[PDB]
Design a protein around this motif. Sequence first.
Motif, PDB file in Angstrom:
ATOM      1  N   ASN L 103      56.622 -47.726 110.101  1.00 16.22           N
ATOM      2  CA  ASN L 103      56.318 -48.843 109.224  1.00 16.22           C
ATOM      3  C   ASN L 103      57.507 -49.778 109.206  1.00 16.22           C
ATOM      4  OD1 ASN L 103      55.740 -50.730 107.198  1.00 16.22           O
ATOM      5  ND2 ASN L 103      54.952 -49.214 105.770  1.00 16.22           N
ATOM      6  N   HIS L 105      57.922 -52.565 107.847  1.00 10.67           N
ATOM      7  CA  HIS L 105      58.172 -53.214 106.530  1.00 10.67           C
ATOM      8  C   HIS L 105      58.933 -52.388 105.569  1.00 10.67           C
ATOM      9  CE1 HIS L 105      55.852 -56.358 108.086  1.00 10.67           C
ATOM     10  NE2 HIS L 105      54.944 -55.458 108.398  1.00 10.67           N
ATOM     11  N   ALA L 106      59.135 -51.147 105.915  1.00  8.02           N
ATOM     12  CA  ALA L 106      59.734 -50.173 104.982  1.00  8.02           C
ATOM     13  C   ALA L 106      61.183 -49.924 105.321  1.00  8.02           C
ATOM     14  CB  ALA L 106      58.940 -48.827 105.029  1.00  8.02           C
ATOM     15  N   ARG L 107      61.739 -50.710 106.213  1.00  7.21           N
ATOM     16  CA  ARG L 107      63.060 -50.475 106.731  1.00  7.21           C
ATOM     17  C   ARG L 107      63.935 -51.663 106.333  1.00  7.21           C
ATOM     18  NH1 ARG L 107      62.480 -48.673 112.866  1.00  7.21           N
ATOM     19  NH2 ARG L 107      64.569 -47.963 112.384  1.00  7.21           N
ATOM     20  N   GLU L 108      64.931 -52.007 107.145  1.00  2.41           N
ATOM     21  CA  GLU L 108      65.794 -53.118 106.772  1.00  2.41           C
ATOM     22  C   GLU L 108      65.009 -54.446 106.782  1.00  2.41           C
ATOM     23  OE1 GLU L 108      66.330 -50.959 109.362  1.00  2.41           O
ATOM     24  OE2 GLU L 108      68.409 -50.170 109.132  1.00  2.41           O
ATOM     25  N   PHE L 110      65.742 -57.349 108.155  1.00  4.27           N
ATOM     26  CA  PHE L 110      65.612 -58.002 109.459  1.00  4.27           C
ATOM     27  C   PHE L 110      64.385 -57.517 110.283  1.00  4.27           C
ATOM     28  CE2 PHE L 110      68.551 -54.537 110.798  1.00  4.27           C
ATOM     29  CZ  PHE L 110      67.928 -54.070 111.918  1.00  4.27           C
ATOM     30  N   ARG L 111      63.929 -56.297 110.012  1.00  2.94           N
ATOM     31  CA  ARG L 111      62.756 -55.767 110.799  1.00  2.94           C
ATOM     32  C   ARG L 111      61.441 -56.392 110.325  1.00  2.94           C
ATOM     33  NH1 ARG L 111      64.661 -51.532 114.172  1.00  2.94           N
ATOM     34  NH2 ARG L 111      66.617 -50.669 113.308  1.00  2.94           N
ATOM     35  N   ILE L 124      49.471 -53.299 114.169  1.00  2.87           N
ATOM     36  CA  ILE L 124      49.374 -51.992 113.560  1.00  2.87           C
ATOM     37  C   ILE L 124      50.754 -51.368 113.467  1.00  2.87           C
ATOM     38  CG2 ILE L 124      48.404 -49.669 113.664  1.00  2.87           C
ATOM     39  CD1 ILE L 124      46.259 -50.782 115.577  1.00  2.87           C
ATOM     40  N   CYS L 125      51.156 -50.963 112.272  1.00  4.12           N
ATOM     41  CA  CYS L 125      52.426 -50.277 112.158  1.00  4.12           C
ATOM     42  C   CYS L 125      52.354 -49.118 111.163  1.00  4.12           C
ATOM     43  CB  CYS L 125      53.557 -51.221 111.854  1.00  4.12           C
ATOM     44  SG  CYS L 125      53.499 -51.817 110.161  1.00  4.12           S
ATOM     45  N   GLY L 126      53.128 -48.109 111.446  1.00  5.01           N
ATOM     46  CA  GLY L 126      53.296 -46.993 110.534  1.00  5.01           C
ATOM     47  C   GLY L 126      52.340 -45.816 110.652  1.00  5.01           C
TER      48      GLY L 126
END
Lengths: 145, 145, 145, 145, 145, 145, 145, 145, 145, 145, 145, 145
Positions: L103, L105-108, L110-111, L124-126
Amino acid sequence: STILVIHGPNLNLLGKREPEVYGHLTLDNINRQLIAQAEQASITLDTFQSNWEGAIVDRIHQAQTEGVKLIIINPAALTHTSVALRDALLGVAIPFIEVHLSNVHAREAFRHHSYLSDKAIGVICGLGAKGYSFALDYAIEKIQP
Amino acid sequence: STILVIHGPNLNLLGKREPEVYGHLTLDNINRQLIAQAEQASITLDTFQSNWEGAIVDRIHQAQTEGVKLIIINPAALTHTSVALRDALLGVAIPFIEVHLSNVHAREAFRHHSYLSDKAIGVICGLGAKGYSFALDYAIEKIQP
Amino acid sequence: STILVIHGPNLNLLGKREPEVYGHLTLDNINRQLIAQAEQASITLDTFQSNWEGAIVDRIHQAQTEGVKLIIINPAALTHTSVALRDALLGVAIPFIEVHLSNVHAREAFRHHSYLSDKAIGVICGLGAKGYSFALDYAIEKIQP
Amino acid sequence: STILVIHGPNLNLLGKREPEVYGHLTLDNINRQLIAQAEQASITLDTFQSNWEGAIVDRIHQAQTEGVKLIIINPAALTHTSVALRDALLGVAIPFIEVHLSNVHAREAFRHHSYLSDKAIGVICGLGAKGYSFALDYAIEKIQP
Amino acid sequence: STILVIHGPNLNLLGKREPEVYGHLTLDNINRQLIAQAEQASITLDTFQSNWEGAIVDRIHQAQTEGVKLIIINPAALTHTSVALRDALLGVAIPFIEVHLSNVHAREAFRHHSYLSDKAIGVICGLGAKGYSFALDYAIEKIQP
Amino acid sequence: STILVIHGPNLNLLGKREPEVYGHLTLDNINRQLIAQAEQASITLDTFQSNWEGAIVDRIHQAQTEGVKLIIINPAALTHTSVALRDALLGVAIPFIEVHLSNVHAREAFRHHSYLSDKAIGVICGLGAKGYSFALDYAIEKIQP
Amino acid sequence: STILVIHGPNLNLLGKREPEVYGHLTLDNINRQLIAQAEQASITLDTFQSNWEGAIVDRIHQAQTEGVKLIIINPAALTHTSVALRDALLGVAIPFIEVHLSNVHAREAFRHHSYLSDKAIGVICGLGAKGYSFALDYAIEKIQP
Amino acid sequence: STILVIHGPNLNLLGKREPEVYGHLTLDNINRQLIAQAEQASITLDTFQSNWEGAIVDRIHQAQTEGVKLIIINPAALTHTSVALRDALLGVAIPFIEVHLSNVHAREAFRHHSYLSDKAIGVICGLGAKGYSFALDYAIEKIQP
Amino acid sequence: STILVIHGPNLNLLGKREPEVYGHLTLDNINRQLIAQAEQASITLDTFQSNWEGAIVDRIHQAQTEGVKLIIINPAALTHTSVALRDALLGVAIPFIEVHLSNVHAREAFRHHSYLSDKAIGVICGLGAKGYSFALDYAIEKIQP
Amino acid sequence: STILVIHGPNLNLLGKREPEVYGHLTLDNINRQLIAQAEQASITLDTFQSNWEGAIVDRIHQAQTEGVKLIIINPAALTHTSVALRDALLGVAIPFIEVHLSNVHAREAFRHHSYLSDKAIGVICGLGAKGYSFALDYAIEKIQP
Amino acid sequence: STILVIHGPNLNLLGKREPEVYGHLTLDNINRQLIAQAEQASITLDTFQSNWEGAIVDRIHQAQTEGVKLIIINPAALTHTSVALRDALLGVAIPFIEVHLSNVHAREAFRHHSYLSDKAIGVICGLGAKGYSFALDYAIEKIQP
Amino acid sequence: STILVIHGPNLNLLGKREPEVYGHLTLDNINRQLIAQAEQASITLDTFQSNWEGAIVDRIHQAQTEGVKLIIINPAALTHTSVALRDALLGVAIPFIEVHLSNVHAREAFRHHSYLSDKAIGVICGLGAKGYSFALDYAIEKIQP
């Protein structure tokens, strides 16, 4: 109805508090003026006010099925926050005019942004109650020139 | 009522989930404490909670007609998003104190911004349930000699 | 002492100028009220004020060796500028509550930011002198439940 | 004159060739309509257009000495750039309404910012030529209730 | 020649709290190591620590007077806040190396900005006490190649 | 009708380094010029310089009790960083003029912000030592017209 | 040697409106005072005012061919907007001092930015008409030391 | 004319000041080169320079009525400030090429932004006088098939 | 086991407008497909749509009391605005997958931000109705590996 | 326990151009010094340089399979741009020290940002070739205490 | 070679998809036109295209050893992302002209920023293939006047 | 091949280190599942992984010549940095679906930004490896409804 006038949250308070703050004009006074202005042109006009975003969205959806041709909307505080409202209007594809009583640009910086203005036919702000009458005159002219 | 306590969305969940997470204290326990504190000072106090922005706005309007003198409000998530709530408070011109159970400044950056704090008498955050009691103590002193 | 109250720069001016402007309450009055409130719970309480960041830092370092259990701090103007103060509190690992007399959110934008708030247990602002009393009430309960 | 209508840069292109305009309307047609509307209320009205910031500033200064009571101004591109214009209007202290033919919010992001709107009585955009007429109606009522 | 090592606010705490947290190394251990390292190269080395910005500024001014050739500075929290310190170093025109025990880039975003780094010869961070030794090794070579 | 001149950190270095760099003029030379200019108008004038924020704040608090009518202040690096200074001036309510020797706008971007300028009567920068003389000339007129 | 004083847009309004608003001092009064000050030092001084950016730019270009040594400029509103004006001054390479009557930093945030200040010798603001006299004093000393 | 070349403010200064600064080349030399280049292709070319924004706007309007097919414009400082100029070019719908003598990207950050570049066919900067010749070469080729 | 699918505001409009615009697929069609897919795995699939934020918050709270194992949520416009929704999901601690029919990154910049995505297991956007199916496939495997 | 030294793009140019610009030191000289330093401590050291991001990533992946314990990396320009490099280092979970010959903070603002520094053990910049030696000294101590 | 033309990633695709799209011109055609143009001036011209950043960097390093006097570069997508490329060009100190086929300012906001433009002699964009020819004309004149 | 699956940098590391950290699933395992899924639908599927940006770009160009109808791409780190990749996909005009295992969106922060998502059909992510399967399902239906 052919024209629908929508008033957003807190507009029900008009004229309630110290009628020498902002005087005596009420939301009903405004509505009655508009209904009479519309009757003069043989145009059917409905009005709606709510403090609840969902009720306003529902009312917009209903407008589509009722064959409303134009919406005159004062979203009040919801203009700065409600994408749901934007997407309701766009989703029913009823053209609209945005109206505010007060001059939105003369107030705090967060009031300068609108989720509606960029999609409105036009915007009127700061002209008090007459702003709604102007929007209605335009709307009538568009439909019956 | 003289004092009205308003709790925002999700505050009904207090003490419901794993009473080892955040323990056992419920919204009702908070309200009972406040009602008793107010009774001690012979001040009438009412409470209200809702997950619906419009219900809160309507309740604030009703507060005006009931002669409420001060509002103690925990808007929870609505603090960061609701201009409608700001404009409800300002429109009825009832002074208010903003309260949060948790420390809003210690969480994500979007929780550092409030549409209410700048218009509140004052703000208490991070002191749990006691925050509401403190607000009430202040309110009592302001309203009574 | 068990509890240490720190007042930042310019707080020594309280009640000095035109006591009608913000009235007659002095820093010493506040301290006396707090010392009495603490005595009433059999807690030892010390107070400190300085206009010099370094003196405040040094005093925090001393609080550690003295076994101070909690700091109530009104950093005043230093809240917006002093990372040194943040690092002093964190370095001695004494929990703290941040207090301001005035509502920091109702003033200039630069006052909205704090190098302390995110590490404080909680924050109280805008409730005048009572804010310190509330912080003390919390502190007492936390230390001697 | 009692009322002065100012048109900013590039407005002379309406109708003569239409820059990107729609309706076939011209700046002179707009002026004739407003002059006739004003005559119908026994209010004296002057009009002015220029592509030159200095000419507009001069004209505003001249409005003061002529006893103009309200300005209706379509600054066109100068709304986004001209602090000189803002300062002319404020310096003479003549109230003004801001008018745009097109919806300034529906275009590039830079057109969302105005050096005038915050000081205007109000703003009308996106309603075409009727926008000026609405302004004039408002103005008439304000000057001659 | 003469090298001066300056330590900023809170660095006096090193090794005092729970020597488990980050262990037993004290500021005086660091200074002893550096003094011995310098003695080994027949270079005279002085050290200075303060919690007070003004003391540090004064000391830098004194440095010039004493013909100090290079400053090794760990400004600690002052690196993010003190323009006064920047201007002291520039005003005496003594070249300097900036050192931090911990990796300033791995912490909060406000710690990423320095009022010194852009004017330092170079910067070392995150290598603990060895960072100072490295700076001293560099300095020795620069002064006595 | 006392005037107090305050010089901030690093200003003691004036004329010390390479008197060709920024010439031979010293802080004491500036003070002598001002004292003589004030004597010429039969106005009593004091001066103060420090590297320490707290010393400056204290000196401002003392100015109030001494009946100082106006402060001429060059805060040097503290202009960009001290809210404490701002709040000292505002707390004693002594009007002030801000002076800088060099043109602050021609240097790094962080020097373009001042925590004083918005509250100063006015600001003078870039005109060297004369800037203080000008501030004094203004002050004299204001106090003894 | 010749000094040129340039006044920007709207400065012709000085003293025209309600002479108690900002009193009775006119642009002509300012110019008379400066001409007399210059005569007293045997310096030739010319003055110029316009509301038209291009007129000012032309006048700057003329200054080069006339051998003007220094320009004293109050660009008024153009300071925030006119890169043309910047480039005219830089293109002729006549040093200049920027003057404003009012304190630009004490007004709206957009008035904090200047396209001139960074290239000016110095800047004076908020000291009223005297600011221009000070600039002239400086200029005289620079040209005839 | 089929092609119009517009030069903005301050371009009249070219080659005037210290001809070993930025050389001897004058605006006239540029124009003569372009006119000769156009005559060589049997293309009619006109040129225009002004320090006055309104004059440039007027000239663009005139270009429309003269049947100009392409504009080669060096707006100089106006590129960063003039939305009026943008709206003139768009309003007459004459394609244009933007030219600068110097490399606009290699200077201050504010020169990186343009109200024209996004609507230009293309942009040439930093190639001195040859930039205009290249724009003309392009234009000739375009005004053909 | 129960999986709950929540559809946000305006999704009731799917396949109403211009069925050649975005074709004929309705919210009910989507639900029927999902229900069949869930039945295949002997999982109960509950569905809910509303235009009202509070209704959705209440429904999430109801999910907790009924032991729902996972939520699949298309918040539609509320994604970008509702912290109340975020706090509902987090407060009940039911894991969730976020789904959008359209590619939210391909639209206006304000649609790029989500108050949910960072806490979701994952996110699917732009794959139309199949997005919900994919989310459900994943959900089934996570509940019944 | 090998140490791997990685040099990024353009570092192959060292000492090639006008050996007085930055003297004579070559990449190979640096490597020889480090190899000798490592041999002196009985540590095996490998080196690698490339202008190709992918080659560097491949080399890092190989380092894992070779049992490398610590990486000393000078990513040069890739520090500001390469998330792939960040993710290669993290993915293999080999600790690293970041080194730059020049002071990255003394250059353009874009060089202040790094996709590596926050995950490095530490960072050395601006101390020339010695920076790599220091990193190696640290590394030796960490691996063989 | 005396002049080297570098084409960045994806430029190999020119003319390869839907020749009525962007027509039939190929990268080869552009190179052939340039090589012929250079032959006309007896100037030796080399060309290079790659999708790989490292290959381009290597090629720039080779250019130094070959005595290349000027680089004409279309970095394509790398202009917005590659500091490695900037540092290669700067490291070999070969002057360069930046060229783009399309108008980079007319596209997405991220394409407005270049890591090259500020160091280029100049920049040409939006003039298609002719841009490179213009750059070559300029380069020839610079090298052999 | 009809469908091409591209994996970006570092994805070769899947399942290599500490198969407990993220378990045992390898890139080859993912490819085998996709190849089997494609075979089941009689669609030809190719796969590709590289750590080198240029290799990926080259491979995309090659996909055009092979008649690939859709690309499934996990760009991994290159999603946040590679405009070259964006331009390759756009330049061959092969539609694509973006996939991430984790995912983003759940990280830094800048990602959160992608140079691809806006031009993807969807993202699709995560959802781990199943994300690729989903994309393949969608692609199959699009290509062979």
